[PDB]
Design a binder for this molecule. Structure first.
Ligand SMILES: OC[C@H]1O[C@H](O[C@H]2[C@H](O)[C@@H](O)[C@H](O)O[C@@H]2CO)[C@H](O)[C@@H](O)[C@@H]1O
Ligand SMILES: OC[C@H]1O[C@@H](O)[C@H](O)[C@@H](O)[C@@H]1O
Ligand SMILES: OC[C@H]1O[C@H](O)[C@H](O)[C@@H](O)[C@@H]1O
Length: 490
């Protein structure tokens, strides 16, 4: 039955639906919008549960009231929810139209210890996320950063227990860095970065620097230092000593640094996912993380932007599959945040390959046998964008004999706004939803299309780093159709 080819569609709620004062501002306004989504056949919505808003007053001073009111409304409108444990700041990234800092009390600590923030070679501290360097440092009034995230999720679980039991919350997204993605803040607009700048390494805080020097010493090279020839945010790879042909990134020193730099993210993600598994154990929900889609410079040997962001991906080294393997022990979903783009839409000098990047990442996920989800990176309302998303959702088309051999677990659309609801735009969107659903009407029971959710089980045993890095072995991607068989048209 066609229903087996059905891929659910979710929509992101506006940023700031509950303001920085922890007040659910416009319920009536949101209700009307939500009801229109319900009529269009949308399966559910996604929302940020901001750490900076809930634990503002002080350590363990949680106020969940406004968010309970929001969840209540969403449930009344017949929609499911994907909740993001947003441990990051809203404001310094593309599209951020509102400012939501991390808890003020954490910022107060940062005043007397600036090293809790990601730092670039120039000494600039980024305050949108806590460096991975303090994950296990008990400097936050007795707690470590990971313990803070852990307590936050447990409190969420207990205070929203009634919504979890009623099946409202379907996915639990755990923020792992800037914009909630597992990556370093290598391309900060707030510091002047501009597409397609290569970005900068963000490992200069005293904690990461100390770890690196200890590590190089154990490797027999205590003289080794952090990169000093990688350039600046807006540089191009060829104008740097680190990323040029036969440059530093290809030397033993460079490869050691790059492995070290990227391994820190794998462990950061693995440890926090461990805490997430414990906090939601037994609940009927799935865990998920977000991986950023850095398509610029993907078409040159150095993959500069990817490397500075923490994804050690080269033509001969798969820097994404090991993340997929790490997610398997947690039975988690890998969400790729950039699926609507086409190569021909990028300036030629950016050397972008978003289409090839998507195929690499999704194939790696299916290869490791984990579920893969996604979102569009930029606001799009045209058919060609929707058709590109539909192609990646079922790379080899629909199957009339049963389920597709390959299909994404779901797609979340960015974002809910008045432009989307504009008559003509919404008209196209409704066709998009219909095609994602494979021409079938909205289906309320996820079980009908093999999307039933079982109680979350404890994570499988810890996979050693050496076994994780075995997944760096390059593999051929799965075959992709040139265009989807379920077009929206135009
Ligand atoms: O509300 C979700 C997050 O939205 C933004 O980040 C987006 C980014 O704009 C988009 O290109 C990509 O596809 O997904 C990320 C994360 O979903 C905000 O900057 C974040 O603060 C929000 O968490
Ligand atoms: O953040 C920089 C952004 O600039 C915009 O003008 C482009 O259209 C986006 O593709 C790009 O991501
Ligand atoms: O990090 C913010 C955004 O940057 C750009 C990437 O293409 C997108 O996937 C990401 O979400």
């Amino acid at each position: 039955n066609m229903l087996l080819n059905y891929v659910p569609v979710y929509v992101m709620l506006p940023l700031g639906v509950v303001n920085v004062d922890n007040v659910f501002e416009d319920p009536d306004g949101l209700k009307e919008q939500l009801l229109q989504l319900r009529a269009a056949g949308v399966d559910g919505v996604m929302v940020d549960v901001w750490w900076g808003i809930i634990e503002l007053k002080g350590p363990k001073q949680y106020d969940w009231r406004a968010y309970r009111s929001l969840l209540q409304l969403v449930q009344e409108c017949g929609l499911t929810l994907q909740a993001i444990m947003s441990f990051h700041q809203c404001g310094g990234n593309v599209g951020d139209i509102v400012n939501i800092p991390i808890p003020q009390w954490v910022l107060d600590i940062g005043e007397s210890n600036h090293d809790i923030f990601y730092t670039n070679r120039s000494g600039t501290r980024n305050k949108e996320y806590l460096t991975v360097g303090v994950d296990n440092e008990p400097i936050f009034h007795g707690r470590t950063a990971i313990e803070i995230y852990s307590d936050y999720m447990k409190s969420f679980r207990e205070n929203m227990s009634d919504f979890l039991e009623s099946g409202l919350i379907i996915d639990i997204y755990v923020g792992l860095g800037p914009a909630g993605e597992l990556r370093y803040p290598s391309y900060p607009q707030s510091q002047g970065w501009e597409f397609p700048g290569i970005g900068e390494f963000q490992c200069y805080d005293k904690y990461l620097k100390a770890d690196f020097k200890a590590a190089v010493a154990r490797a027999g090279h205590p003289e080794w230092e952090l990169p000093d020839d990688a350039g600046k945010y807006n540089d191009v790879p060829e104008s740097t000593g680190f990323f040029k042909s036969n440059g530093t990134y290809v030397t033993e020193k460079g490869k050691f640094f790059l492995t070290w730099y990227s391994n820190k993210l794998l462990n950061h993600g693995d440890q926090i996912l461990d805490e997430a598994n414990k906090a939601f154990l037994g609940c009927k929900v799935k865990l998920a993380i977000k991986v950023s889609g850095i398509h610029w410079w993907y078409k040159v040997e150095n993959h500069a932007a990817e490397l500075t962001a923490g994804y050690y991906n080269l033509n001969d080294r798969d820097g994404y599959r090991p993340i997929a393997r790490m997610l398997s022990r947690h039975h988690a979903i890998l969400n790729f945040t950039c699926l609507e783009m086409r190569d021909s839409e990028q300036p030629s000098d950016a050397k972008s390959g978003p289409q090839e990047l998507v195929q690499q990442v999704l194939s790696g996920g299916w290869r490791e046998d984990i579920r893969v989800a996604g979102e569009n990176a930029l606001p799009r309302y045209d058919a060609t964008a929707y058709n590109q998303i539909i192609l990646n959702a079922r790379p080899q088309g629909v199957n009339n004999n049963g389920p597709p051999k390959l299909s994404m677990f779901g797609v979340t659309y960015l974002r809910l706004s008045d432009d989307l609801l504009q008559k003509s735009n919404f008209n196209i969107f409704k066709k998009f939803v219909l095609k994602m659903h494979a021409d079938q009407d909205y289906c309320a029971n996820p079980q009908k299309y093999n999307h039933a959710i079982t109680p979350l089980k404890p994570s499988a045993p810890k996979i050693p780093i050496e076994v994780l890095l075995e997944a760096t072995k390059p593999t051929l991607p799965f075959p992709w159709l040139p265009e989807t068989d379920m077009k929206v048209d135009g």
